Amino acid sequence: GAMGSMERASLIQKAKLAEQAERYEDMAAFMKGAVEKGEELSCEERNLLSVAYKNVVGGQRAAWRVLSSIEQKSNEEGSEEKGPEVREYREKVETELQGVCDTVLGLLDSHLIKEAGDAESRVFYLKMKGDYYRYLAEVATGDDKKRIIDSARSAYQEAMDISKKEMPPTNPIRLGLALNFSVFHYEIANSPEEAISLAKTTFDEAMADLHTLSEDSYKDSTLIMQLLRDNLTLWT
Amino acid sequence: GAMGSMERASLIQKAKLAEQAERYEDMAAFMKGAVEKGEELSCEERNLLSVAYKNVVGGQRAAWRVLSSIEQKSNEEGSEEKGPEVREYREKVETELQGVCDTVLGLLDSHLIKEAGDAESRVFYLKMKGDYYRYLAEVATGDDKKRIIDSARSAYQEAMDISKKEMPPTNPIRLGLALNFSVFHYEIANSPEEAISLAKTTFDEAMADLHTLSEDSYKDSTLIMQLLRDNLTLWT
Amino acid sequence: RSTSTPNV
Amino acid sequence: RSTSTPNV
Ligand SMILES: *SCCNC(=O)C1CCN(C(=O)C(C)(C)Oc2ccc(Cl)cc2)CC1
Ligand SMILES: *SCCNC(=O)C1CCN(C(=O)C(C)(C)Oc2ccc(Cl)cc2)CC1
Ligand SMILES: [Cl-]
Ligand SMILES: [Cl-]
Ligand SMILES: [Mg+2]
Ligand SMILES: [Mg+2]
Ligand SMILES: [Mg+2]
Ligand SMILES: [Mg+2]
Ligand SMILES: [Mg+2]
Ligand SMILES: [Mg+2]
């Protein structure tokens, strides 16, 4: 739509400017426009797409959590009926969040994943698919929640299978995937023991491969390993 | 427009929820809707209107400053021609900022100021008018800049005249007005000596009236006095 | 940059 | 809440 008249390179340039200006909604719109040009994305471009939408959905998730907590407190025993406004506004934010998730999933399905043949690209996109289904799961209820959870699980599992066959255990995309899948198990799937096992095995297999890395690669891998350890400390 | 079907009280309630959720664009839309109901605003409601638009325009101002600095560096001696993208994107943000300022000024002109008869309300709105003209001045150039600067000055001056006749020197609206008018003099009007004089006189006349205040009133007045002192330290 | 009045 | 992968 609105970015169809702008050059791909200009969209990428403006995404980078939007990032510097902390204008993440603009950044996401620019990167959506770039994806819709139909060409595969470079590593740097995949990162720009991810940063943009992560910041947009992250603000929405934070807002939804605030409103859901107010709503839950409004619905307790001996709370004053305050009318429909809290629910309405929580629903408004929820619907916007779902729309962002649907937009990202649509870009991945049309046609980023199917055109991604290298492991680094395909795993990145499958991880993203699991992440955006996970964000949908955070706000879902009931049987709808069940199917969304299964979709997140399936995307993460495909990404796991590829990453284990095609990437070293210290690869940051592989590590971040495993981190996020462990969060899925703990926070979404009610499988804390699976979460703990995955985080431990991931950490230990990365530790054993650190000796192969340059200083810069070591910094990235150890940063994610620290997040695995942080979660293990929270979970045990 | 879009808020016409929602009750005034529900708009105010949702503005407060949006504030808690740090959803300031939503907050501003709710408060615009409340203003357009046509009734005067209470003190609390005036504060909600101000908080909402201050946070929206504040993010835009911060973004515009980042982009203007990149643009200025792009236009230096021995810089690579990078094309029209930085200017285009700075213009996009600028136009959105101007639109927000025009929206606020429109609410003040239709009809918040004319219906405000009490000094506390009228001064609040005239200060806001000066502020939003000042934000327009920050991005303006040339002769357009001259007329916008004059409009800011005129609004602030009317607010000053009323506040000096009708409010004590410690009143926080009077103090914040004087603070902002001093910023106008220093940062916009190229009148640093006027800025310094106004800040000093305001500080000293407030100091002399602090003995009349309760603990809570004292806290608010002294907070703004500290900002006057901070600016005086920066300016001298 | 000079400091103006902060929000609530 | 558990920590997921941070942005760049
Ligand atoms: S009665 C009008 C609505 N209330 C206010 O504007 C007050 C809100 C909270 N507050 C402040 O945060 C400080 C102390 C910074 O002072 C001012 C804020 C905003 C303005 Cl317009 C003026 C002073 C007190 C004022
Ligand atoms: S090659 C694909 C694009 N690059 C990246 O995603 C990398 C960007 C920066 N970065 C990180 O911030 C940390 C170390 C947190 O790790 C990850 C970030 C994002 C993902 Cl998807 C995975 C790991 C390294 C990765
Ligand atoms: Cl709503
Ligand atoms: Cl643009
Ligand atoms: Mg082209
Ligand atoms: Mg009761
Ligand atoms: Mg819903
Ligand atoms: Mg009514
Ligand atoms: Mg050169
Ligand atoms: Mg312009």
Author numbering:
A (entry chain A), B (entry chain A): -4 to 231
C (entry chain P), D (entry chain P): 256 to 263
From the manuscript:
In the initial screen, compound 1 was identified as top hit for ERα, C-RAF, and USP8. In all three validation assays, 1 displayed a strong preference for C-RAF, followed by ERα and USP8, and had no activity with FOXO1 or SOS1. In the protein titrations, 1 increased peptide affinity for 14-3-3σ by 81-fold in the C-RAF complex, 19-fold for 14-3-3σ/ERα, and 4-fold for 14-3-3σ/USP8. Crystal structures for compound 1 were obtained by cocrystallizing with ERα, C-RAF, or USP8 bound to 14-3-3σ, with clear density for both 1 and the peptides. Compound 1 showed an identical binding mode in the presence of C-RAF, for which the +1 Thr was 3.5 Å from the phenyl ring, while the remainder of the C-RAF peptide wrapped around the fragment. These additional hydrophobic interactions could explain the higher fold stabilization with the C-RAF peptide compared to ERα. By contrast, the +4 Val of C-RAF allowed for more space, thereby positioning 1 in a preferred conformation. Next to these C-RAF selective stabilizers, the nonselective stabilizer compound 1 also showed a large fold-stabilization toward the C-RAF peptide. A crystallographic overlay of these three scaffolds revealed remarkable differences in conformation of the C-RAF/compound interactions. These changes highlight the flexibility of the C-RAF peptide, perhaps leading to its facility for stabilization, especially in the case of the stabilizers’ phenyl ring, which can occupy a wide range of positions and conformations in combination with the C-RAF client phosphopeptide.
